[PDB]
Amino acid sequence: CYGSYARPTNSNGGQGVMVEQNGKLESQVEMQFFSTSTNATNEVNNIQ
């Protein structure tokens, strides 16, 4: 973390490599989910 920089790309200060695909409008950012392993690691119920 000490001394690391990443220039802004969007208008209101959001970093992220805006790649171009039929237009630079595309800007890929993915979402990943996580739950408590030790919930029990075992729940017949659909984990949240």
Q: Which stretches of the chain bind another protein, using CB under 8 A?
A: 38, 40, 42
CB atoms within 10 A of CB 43: 11
Rg (CA), the chain: 18
Query: Cβ of residue 43: shortest distance to another protein, in angstroms?
Result: 9
Nearer residue to another protein within complex by CB, 21 or 42: 42
In whole angstroms, the minimum distance from the beta carbon of 44 to another protein comes to 12
Minimum separation from the CB atom of position 45 to another protein (A): 12
Count CA atoms closer than 13 A to 35's CA, side-chain side: 9
* Residue that the structure tokens 């729940």 belong to: 43
